[PDB]
Structure formats: C-alpha cells, structure tokens
GROMACS .gro file of N, CA and C in nm:
model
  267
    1UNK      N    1   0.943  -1.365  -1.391
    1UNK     CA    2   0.795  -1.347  -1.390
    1UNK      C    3   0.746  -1.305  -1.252
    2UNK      N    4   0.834  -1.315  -1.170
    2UNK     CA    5   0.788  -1.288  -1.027
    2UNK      C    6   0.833  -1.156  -0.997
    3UNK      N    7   0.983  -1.104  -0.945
    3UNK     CA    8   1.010  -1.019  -0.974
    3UNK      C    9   1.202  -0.976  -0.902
    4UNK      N   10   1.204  -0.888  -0.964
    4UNK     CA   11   1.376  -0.862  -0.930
    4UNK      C   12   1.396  -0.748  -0.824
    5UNK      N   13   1.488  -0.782  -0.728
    5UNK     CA   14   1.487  -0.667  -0.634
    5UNK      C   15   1.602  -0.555  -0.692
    6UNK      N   16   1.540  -0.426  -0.640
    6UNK     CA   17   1.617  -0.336  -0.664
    6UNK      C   18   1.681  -0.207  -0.611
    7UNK      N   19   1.773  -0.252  -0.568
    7UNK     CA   20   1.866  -0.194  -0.404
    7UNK      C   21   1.901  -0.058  -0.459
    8UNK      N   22   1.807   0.044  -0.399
    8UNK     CA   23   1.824   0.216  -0.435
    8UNK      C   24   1.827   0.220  -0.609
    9UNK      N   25   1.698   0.221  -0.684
    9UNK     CA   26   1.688   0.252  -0.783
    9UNK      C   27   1.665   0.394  -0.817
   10UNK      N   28   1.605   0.425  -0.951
   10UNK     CA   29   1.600   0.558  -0.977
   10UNK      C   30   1.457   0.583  -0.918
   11UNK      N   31   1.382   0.508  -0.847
   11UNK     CA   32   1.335   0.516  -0.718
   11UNK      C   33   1.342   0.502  -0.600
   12UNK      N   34   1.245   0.517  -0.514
   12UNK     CA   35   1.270   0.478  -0.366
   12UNK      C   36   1.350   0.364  -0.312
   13UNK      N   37   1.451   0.341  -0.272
   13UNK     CA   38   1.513   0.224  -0.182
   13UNK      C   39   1.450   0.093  -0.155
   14UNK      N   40   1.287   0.120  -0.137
   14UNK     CA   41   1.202   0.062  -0.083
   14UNK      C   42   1.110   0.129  -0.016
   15UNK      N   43   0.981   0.075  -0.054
   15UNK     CA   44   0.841   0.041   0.003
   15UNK      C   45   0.780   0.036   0.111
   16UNK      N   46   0.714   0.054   0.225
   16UNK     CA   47   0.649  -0.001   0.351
   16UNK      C   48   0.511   0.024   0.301
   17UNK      N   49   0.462  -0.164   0.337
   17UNK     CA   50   0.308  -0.178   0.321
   17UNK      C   51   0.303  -0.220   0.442
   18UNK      N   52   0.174  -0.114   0.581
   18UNK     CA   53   0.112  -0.185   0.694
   18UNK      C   54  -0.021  -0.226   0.662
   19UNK      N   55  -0.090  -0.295   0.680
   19UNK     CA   56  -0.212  -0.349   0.695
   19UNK      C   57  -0.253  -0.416   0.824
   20UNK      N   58  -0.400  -0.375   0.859
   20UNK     CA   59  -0.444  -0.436   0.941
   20UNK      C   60  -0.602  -0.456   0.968
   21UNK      N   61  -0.691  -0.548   0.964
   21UNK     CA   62  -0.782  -0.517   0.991
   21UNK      C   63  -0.840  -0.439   1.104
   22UNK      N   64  -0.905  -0.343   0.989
   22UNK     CA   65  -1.007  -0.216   1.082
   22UNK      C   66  -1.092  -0.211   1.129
   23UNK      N   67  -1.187  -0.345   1.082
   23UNK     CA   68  -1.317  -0.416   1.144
   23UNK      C   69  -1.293  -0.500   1.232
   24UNK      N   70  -1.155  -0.579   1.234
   24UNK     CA   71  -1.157  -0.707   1.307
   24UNK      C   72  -1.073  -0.651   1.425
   25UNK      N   73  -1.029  -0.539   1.410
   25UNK     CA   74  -0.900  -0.513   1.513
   25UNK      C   75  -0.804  -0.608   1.520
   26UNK      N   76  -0.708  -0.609   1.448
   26UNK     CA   77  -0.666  -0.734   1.473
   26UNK      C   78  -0.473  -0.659   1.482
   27UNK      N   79  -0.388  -0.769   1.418
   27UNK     CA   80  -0.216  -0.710   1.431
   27UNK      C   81  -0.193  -0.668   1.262
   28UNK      N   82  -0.119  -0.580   1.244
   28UNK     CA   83  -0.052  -0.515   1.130
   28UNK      C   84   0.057  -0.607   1.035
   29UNK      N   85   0.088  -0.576   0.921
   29UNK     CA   86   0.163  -0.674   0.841
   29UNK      C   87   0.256  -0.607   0.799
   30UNK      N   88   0.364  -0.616   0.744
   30UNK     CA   89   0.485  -0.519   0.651
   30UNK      C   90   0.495  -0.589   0.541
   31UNK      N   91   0.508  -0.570   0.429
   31UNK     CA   92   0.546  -0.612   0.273
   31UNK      C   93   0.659  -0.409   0.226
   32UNK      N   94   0.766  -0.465   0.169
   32UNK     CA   95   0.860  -0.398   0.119
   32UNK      C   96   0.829  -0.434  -0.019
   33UNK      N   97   0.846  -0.319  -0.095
   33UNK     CA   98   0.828  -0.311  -0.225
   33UNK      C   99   0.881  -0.216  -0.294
   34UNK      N  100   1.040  -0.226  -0.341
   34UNK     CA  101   1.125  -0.095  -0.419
   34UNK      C  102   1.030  -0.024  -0.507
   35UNK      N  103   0.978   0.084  -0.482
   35UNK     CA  104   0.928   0.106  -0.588
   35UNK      C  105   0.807   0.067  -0.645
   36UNK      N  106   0.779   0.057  -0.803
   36UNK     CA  107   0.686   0.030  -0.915
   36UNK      C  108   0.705  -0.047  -0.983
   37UNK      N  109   0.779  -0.184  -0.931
   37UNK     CA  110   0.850  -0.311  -0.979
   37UNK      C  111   0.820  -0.352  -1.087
   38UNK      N  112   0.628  -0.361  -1.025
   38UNK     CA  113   0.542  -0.427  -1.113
   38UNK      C  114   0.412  -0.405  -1.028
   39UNK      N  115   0.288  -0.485  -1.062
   39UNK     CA  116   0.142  -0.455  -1.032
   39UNK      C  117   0.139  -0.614  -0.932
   40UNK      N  118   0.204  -0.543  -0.762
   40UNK     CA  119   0.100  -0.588  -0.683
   40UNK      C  120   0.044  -0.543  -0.558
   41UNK      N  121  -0.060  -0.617  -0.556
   41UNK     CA  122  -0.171  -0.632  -0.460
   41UNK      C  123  -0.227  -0.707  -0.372
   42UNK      N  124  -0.184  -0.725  -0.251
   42UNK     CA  125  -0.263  -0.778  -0.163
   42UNK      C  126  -0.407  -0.803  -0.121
   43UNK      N  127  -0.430  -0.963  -0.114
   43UNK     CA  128  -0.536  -0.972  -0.099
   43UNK      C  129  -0.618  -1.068   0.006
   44UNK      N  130  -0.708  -1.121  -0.048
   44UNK     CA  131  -0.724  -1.237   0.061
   44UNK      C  132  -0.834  -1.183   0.143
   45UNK      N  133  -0.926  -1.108   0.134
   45UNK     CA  134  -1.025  -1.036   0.174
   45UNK      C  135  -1.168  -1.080   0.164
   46UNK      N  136  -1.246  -1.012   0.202
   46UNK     CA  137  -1.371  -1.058   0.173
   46UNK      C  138  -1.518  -0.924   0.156
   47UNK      N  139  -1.577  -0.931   0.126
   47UNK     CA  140  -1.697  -0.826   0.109
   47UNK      C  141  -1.714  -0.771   0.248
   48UNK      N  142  -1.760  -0.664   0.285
   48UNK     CA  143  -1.813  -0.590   0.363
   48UNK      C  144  -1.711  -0.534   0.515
   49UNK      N  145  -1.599  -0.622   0.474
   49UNK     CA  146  -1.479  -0.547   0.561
   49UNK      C  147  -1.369  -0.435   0.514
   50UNK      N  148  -1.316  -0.327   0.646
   50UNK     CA  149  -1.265  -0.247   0.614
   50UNK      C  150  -1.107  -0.332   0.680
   51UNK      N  151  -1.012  -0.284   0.580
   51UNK     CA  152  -0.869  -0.292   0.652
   51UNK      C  153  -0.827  -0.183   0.644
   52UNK      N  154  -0.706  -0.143   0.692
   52UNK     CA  155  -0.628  -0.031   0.723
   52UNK      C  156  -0.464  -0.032   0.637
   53UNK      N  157  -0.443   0.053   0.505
   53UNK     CA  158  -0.315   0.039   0.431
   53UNK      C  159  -0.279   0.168   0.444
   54UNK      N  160  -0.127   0.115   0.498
   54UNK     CA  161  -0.027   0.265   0.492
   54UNK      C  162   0.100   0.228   0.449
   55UNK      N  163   0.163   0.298   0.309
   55UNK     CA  164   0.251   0.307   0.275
   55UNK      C  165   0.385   0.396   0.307
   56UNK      N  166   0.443   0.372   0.375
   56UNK     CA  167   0.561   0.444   0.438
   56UNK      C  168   0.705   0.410   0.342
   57UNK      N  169   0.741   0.488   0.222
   57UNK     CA  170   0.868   0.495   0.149
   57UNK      C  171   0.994   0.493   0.238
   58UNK      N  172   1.097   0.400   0.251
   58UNK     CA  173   1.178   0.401   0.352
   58UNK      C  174   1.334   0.423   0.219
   59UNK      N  175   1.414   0.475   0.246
   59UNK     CA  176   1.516   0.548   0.223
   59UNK      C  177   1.682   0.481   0.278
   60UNK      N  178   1.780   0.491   0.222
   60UNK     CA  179   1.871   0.467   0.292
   60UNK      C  180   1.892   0.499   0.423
   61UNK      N  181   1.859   0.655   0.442
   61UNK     CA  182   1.872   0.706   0.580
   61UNK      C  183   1.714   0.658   0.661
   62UNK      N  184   1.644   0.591   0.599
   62UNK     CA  185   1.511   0.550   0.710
   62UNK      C  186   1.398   0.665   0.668
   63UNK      N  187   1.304   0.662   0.708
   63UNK     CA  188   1.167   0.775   0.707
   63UNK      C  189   1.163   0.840   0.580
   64UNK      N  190   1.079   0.769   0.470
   64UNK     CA  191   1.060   0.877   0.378
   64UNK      C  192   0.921   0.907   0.336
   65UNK      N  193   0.851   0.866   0.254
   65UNK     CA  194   0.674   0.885   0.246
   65UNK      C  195   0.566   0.859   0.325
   66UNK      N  196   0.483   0.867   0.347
   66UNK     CA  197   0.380   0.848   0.433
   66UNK      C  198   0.230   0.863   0.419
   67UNK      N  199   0.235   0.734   0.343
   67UNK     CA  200   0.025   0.728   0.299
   67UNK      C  201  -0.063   0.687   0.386
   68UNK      N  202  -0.134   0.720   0.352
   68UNK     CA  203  -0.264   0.632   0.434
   68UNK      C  204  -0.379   0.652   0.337
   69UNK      N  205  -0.406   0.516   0.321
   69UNK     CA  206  -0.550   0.508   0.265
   69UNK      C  207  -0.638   0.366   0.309
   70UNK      N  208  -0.795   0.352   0.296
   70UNK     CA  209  -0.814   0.274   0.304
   70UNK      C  210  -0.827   0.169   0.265
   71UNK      N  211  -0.903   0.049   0.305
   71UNK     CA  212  -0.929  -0.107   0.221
   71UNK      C  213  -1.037  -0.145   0.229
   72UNK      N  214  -1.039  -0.201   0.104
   72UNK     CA  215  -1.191  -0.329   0.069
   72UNK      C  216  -1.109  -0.433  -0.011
   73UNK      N  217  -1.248  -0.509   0.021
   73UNK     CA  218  -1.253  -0.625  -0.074
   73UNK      C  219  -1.311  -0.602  -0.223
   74UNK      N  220  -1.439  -0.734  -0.214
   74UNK     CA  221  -1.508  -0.731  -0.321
   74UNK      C  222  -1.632  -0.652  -0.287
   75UNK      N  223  -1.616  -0.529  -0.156
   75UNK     CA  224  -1.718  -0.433  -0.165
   75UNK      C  225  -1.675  -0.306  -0.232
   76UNK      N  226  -1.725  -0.228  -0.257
   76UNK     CA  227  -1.745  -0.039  -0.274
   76UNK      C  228  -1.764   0.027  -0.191
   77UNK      N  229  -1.640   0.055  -0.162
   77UNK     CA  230  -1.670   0.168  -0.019
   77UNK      C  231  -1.523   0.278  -0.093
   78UNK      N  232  -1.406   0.208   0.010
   78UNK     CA  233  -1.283   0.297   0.018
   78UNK      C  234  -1.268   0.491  -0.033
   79UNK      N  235  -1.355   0.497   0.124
   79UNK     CA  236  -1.384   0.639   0.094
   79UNK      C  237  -1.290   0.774   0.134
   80UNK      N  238  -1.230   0.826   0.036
   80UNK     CA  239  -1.128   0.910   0.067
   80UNK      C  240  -1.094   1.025  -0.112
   81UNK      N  241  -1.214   1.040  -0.153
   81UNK     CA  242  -1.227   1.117  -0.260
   81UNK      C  243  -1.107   1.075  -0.372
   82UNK      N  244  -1.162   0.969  -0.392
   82UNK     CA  245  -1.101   0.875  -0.479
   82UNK      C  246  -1.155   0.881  -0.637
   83UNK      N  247  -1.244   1.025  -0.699
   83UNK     CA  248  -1.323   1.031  -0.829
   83UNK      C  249  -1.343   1.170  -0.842
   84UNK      N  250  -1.265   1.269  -0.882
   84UNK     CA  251  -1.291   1.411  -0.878
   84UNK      C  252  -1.233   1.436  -0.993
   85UNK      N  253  -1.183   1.368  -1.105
   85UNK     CA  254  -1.085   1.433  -1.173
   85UNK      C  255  -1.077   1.418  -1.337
   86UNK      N  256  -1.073   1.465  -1.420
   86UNK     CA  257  -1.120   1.467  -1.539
   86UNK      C  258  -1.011   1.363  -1.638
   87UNK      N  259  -1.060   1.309  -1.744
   87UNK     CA  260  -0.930   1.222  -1.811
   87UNK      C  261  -0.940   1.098  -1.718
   88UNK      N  262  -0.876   0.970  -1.777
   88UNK     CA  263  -0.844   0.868  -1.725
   88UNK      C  264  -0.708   0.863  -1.785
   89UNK      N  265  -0.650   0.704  -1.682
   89UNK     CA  266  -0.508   0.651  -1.801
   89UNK      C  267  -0.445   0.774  -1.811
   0.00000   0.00000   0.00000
C-alpha cells in the first residue's frame, strides 16, 4: 500500500524532487521517485506561499530530465500556462 522500489524500470532509474521555499528563502529537499510508482505529493504547506519544485530524472549514468515548475498550497496561483489545451483525462 505504500510502495515498491524499482531499480531501472521500463522507466527512469529514478526521480529528483528539489523543493524549497521561494517566499521564505529557506534550504532545498531531495525525494527520489522511480518513475510513476503511484500518486505522490508533497505537502505540508499553507495558503499564500510560493515554493520552488524541480524535477531532475537521474539515470544510471547520472543527469537525465530537468523540470521546473512552481508551488502552492491551498492558494491559486502556480503560474506557468498550466490551461491552454482542449480535452481533459
């Protein structure tokens, strides 16, 4: 129910989650995550702050994807043209 690790699947090797608060300035976090395991999400937030999430796909040989997007809480912001596109699901 929690979840199973999975060493070089028919995905990525593994995951890099940084976070850091963008309002508070504060230090960065790492969470590894093979892949699309399952549905999670970090949290622990609050209304009206921004954090900072970048996903970096790391590879047997090291360096592979490289996201950046932003964070909220229980506000509406995370602005990065996140609604342009026709169809859902």
């Amino acid at each position: 129910m929690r979840g199973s690790n999975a060493p070089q699947p028919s995905h990525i090797s593994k995951y890099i989650l940084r976070w850091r608060p963008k309002n508070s300035v504060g230090r960065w976090k790492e969470a590894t995550i093979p892949g699309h395991l399952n549905s999670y999400t970090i949290k622990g937030l609050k209304p009206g702050v921004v954090y900072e999430g970048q996903l970096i796909s790391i590879q047997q040989y090291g360096h592979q994807e490289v996201t950046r997007f932003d964070f909220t809480t229980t506000s509406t912001s995370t602005p990065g043209s996140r609604s342009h596109h026709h169809h859902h699901h």
